[PDB]
């Protein structure tokens, strides 16, 4: 048995197919079992149609053995492209080993595993090419995440499945040369989605475009929402944000990720370049959902 | 010497360049020596122009040592994209180790080897991503095969060459993220092409389009040829074929492959969904070439 | 620690980011430290804008530790896509191990390393797919090089960085399924660029287009410059060059590379096919820069 064949066979029982079918459509995806009580993690874009139109879509989970079981949507987070499903009263479940994405290094060999019984499912192999790489993702909203970049091929055949290290541990969730959501970030989102059915992210009310020159490189403020924390913090248009809190901002993509790293209700510093002068501002991030939270 | 360098050097002498040149055109490809009597296996699309227009095309085989030798087309099978060439009176030939594609597992490391002296020839490396994956291939006819999907790059530089395991054994023929024809299927086609110069595949006289919903997912009958076995079997238009013989049919691609698995002249069951009712039919497949057969 | 993680960590200190910024633009690239006196090698297309417009572009080098240091353009060679930078008075530099590209074999595992602190920098892994492969490269002029073809991904994230063997030795410079400039060729160009600030390549004054048929395959003369060595050597239009000196010419790409292998001022044979007759001609290559040379 090969080195990668052993690893792929080890986690095959913990990867499932996710089928969402209507009267005229259908779409498949991959998921991973992360809890013995029947909790399955995929990415939010696999089950987007069933979430926005639940009166016409049925979501089932197909196992490695061939068992087909109905599933229930616990919650989803479009801003991190994550979602949690639930299957009821299924015993002898093979739960996946969840690793620590903070221990992943550049050059580590990985497997991008899709569901074994998927239609066009794949299993690709590569290494970790970059860590903490902001990447944008296209009725769901557009988002930007820090991703574990890998030269293993991510496609519709292994999207939603796990990114696996050589210990058969899940270090990421494959998404959309290929990118995966870190498992440490996935644990935070999934733990909140199981508990409350929702996730609350900070907001500032800013639109930014990218800029890169000798004066200042970063995220240039393109808009300020009325009554937003940035409006009450003194942020103006044409400002060039270079630091959000404790993280330097290289472009609009890193800016979106840096805002999510902030704490809701706590004062945070913002460093901008206004008409050639470096100005330090202070904002209090609002929750994107005030009723949840 | 590296692990892959050792394997690539082991099979280099059994991979050849295939040159087809005319008064105004030329195209190169790769082949593999599978028999000491001078039998070379490539895919049918490398030598398509020389087969359809033999009065103007010359087909030569270039070896690893640099020897250029004229070749003769034994036979071809467009429906599996396979062809067999013949070189006469060449001694001390390095015949390739033919493996067993039924022993190949997902995750096995592979090499996609092209001819060493090819112009734009390549040698790519990857793993097996999927097994028994139906895949469509574009004056030759379009076909669909079960393929050994691999994340090793298949291109014009290694097409027609062998897919190689870590024992330097041929497990597939590279074709056209990359796909290869299984060696077990290649042995069946090549053994018949050497014996009779032809291959006879079953036919039903059906055109199908794909369909995927909650009622029924499979291959929807788009046409029925007059006097075809499907016409004498009771298959109608708008039927949704879900099982051809002993193989479930997920789409039109798997349907085309499932028909080739049938036996000519033997009754076979067909399961369709007609106006919401599951109906089991019986057909007797005809030979596509009645004079050969 | 993984096998590739160990190699990537070994050379990380010898790979640098190269930043060229103006009042309205900016572009990043990768380089490699090849000499303790502060000599950095990248490819010519990373610093093209700063070379052609030095009055408006500033070129800085960012190190692994985060140090940003101004850089000076020693010289560039568009015909091989190579350039040498210089940093002054920087001690404790980690100089990269330079290997021997003539000892590289097909199948050898390689790493394509980009600068660690680059914005969209990558580290991809693959094998060597082909050696001595002519490949064309797009106000700089178009060129063709022999390259170490690899199935590791080369992109804007690791372009200009080193191609690394399993001994953490530089065997190539990543450029532009992926290609790299051999380290042996890089040493020749860099040694001349450091010494004289320039590189002198042979010229013939010929334009060629590709041709591949049964009569003759090679580079067909499309133009002859007035007073060129080819004009004084008897080369005519519609000639089909098949051998430049001691190297056979398969197309226009190999022809461009074969000319650079010639010696300036020394008689060299040219074999053409003129109206069906093989004719052997003799040319004396001129220097492309007569004042340097």
UniProtKB/Swiss-Prot annotation, chains A, B, C:
Q: Which GO terms describe its biological process?
A: proteolysis
Q: Which UniProt keywords apply?
A: Cell inner membrane, Cell membrane, Hydrolase, Membrane, Protease, Serine protease, Transmembrane, Transmembrane helix
Broad enzyme group: hydrolase
Q: Which residues lie on this side of the membrane: Periplasmic?
A: 1-290
Q: Name one GO cellular component term.
A: peptidoglycan-based cell wall
Q: Where is the active site?
A: 45 (charge relay system), 81 (charge relay system), 159 (charge relay system)
Write down the membrane topology.
Answer: Single-pass membrane protein
Q: Where in the cell is it found?
A: Cell inner membrane
Whether Protease counts among this entry's keywords is yes
> Where in this chain does the record put each PDZ domain?
188-249
Q: What is its EC number?
A: 3.4.21.107
User: Could you tell me what reaction this enzyme catalyses?
Assistant: Acts on substrates that are at least partially unfolded. The cleavage site P1 residue is normally between a pair of hydrophobic residues, such as Val-|-Val
- Which terms does the record give in the GO molecular function aspect? serine-type endopeptidase activity
| Family recorded in the similarity comment | Belongs to the peptidase S1C family.
State whether it acts alone or in a complex, and with which partners, per the record. Answer: The C-terminal region exhibits both monomeric and trimeric forms in solution.
Reproduce the free-text note on domains from the UniProt record: The periplasmic region consists of a protease domain (PD) and a PDZ domain, connected by a ten-residue linker. Interactions between the PDZ domain and the catalytic domain lead to an inactive conformation.
Reported function: Essential protein that may act as a regulatory protease that is conditionally activated upon appropriate environmental triggers.
Under which name does UniProt file this protein? Probable serine protease HtrA1
Organism equals Mycobacterium tuberculosis (strain ATCC 25618 / H37Rv)
């Amino acid at each position: 048995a090969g080195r990668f064949t052993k690893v792929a066979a080890a986690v095959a029982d913990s990867v499932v197919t996710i089928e969402s079918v209507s009267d005229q459509e259908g779409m498949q995806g991959s998921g991973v079992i992360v809890d013995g009580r029947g909790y399955i993690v995929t990415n939010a874009h696999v089950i987007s149609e069933a979430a926005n139109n639940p009166s016409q879509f049925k979501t089932t989970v197909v196992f490695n053995d061939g068992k087909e079981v109905p599933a229930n949507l616990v919650g989803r987070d479009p801003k991190t492209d994550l979602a949690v499903l639930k299957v009821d009263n299924v015993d002898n479940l093979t739960v996946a080993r969840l690793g620590d994405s903070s221990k992943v290094r550049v050059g580590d060999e990985v497997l991008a595993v899709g569901a074994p019984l998927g239609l066009r499912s794949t299993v690709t192999q590569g290494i970790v090419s970059a860590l903490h790489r902001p990447v944008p993702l296209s009725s769901d909203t557009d988002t930007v995440i820090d991703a574990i970049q890998t030269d293993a091929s991510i496609n519709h055949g292994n999207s939603g499945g796990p990114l696996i290290d050589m210990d058969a541990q899940v270090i990421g969730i494959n998404t959309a040369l290929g990118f995966a959501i870190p498992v440490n970030e996935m644990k935070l989102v999934a733990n909140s989605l199981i508990k409350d059915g929702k996730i609350v992210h900070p907001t500032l009310g800013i639109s930014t475009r990218s800029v890169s020159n000798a004066i200042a490189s970063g995220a240039q403020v393109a808009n300020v929402k009325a009554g937003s924390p940035a409006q009450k913090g003194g942020i103006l248009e044409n400002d060039v944000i270079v630091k959000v809190g404790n993280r330097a901002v290289a472009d609009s993509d890193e800016f979106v990720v840096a805002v999510r790293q902030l704490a809701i209700g706590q004062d945070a510093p913002i460093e901008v370049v206004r008409e050639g002068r470096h100005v330090t501002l202070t904002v209090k991030p609002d929750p994107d959902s005030t009723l949840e939270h």
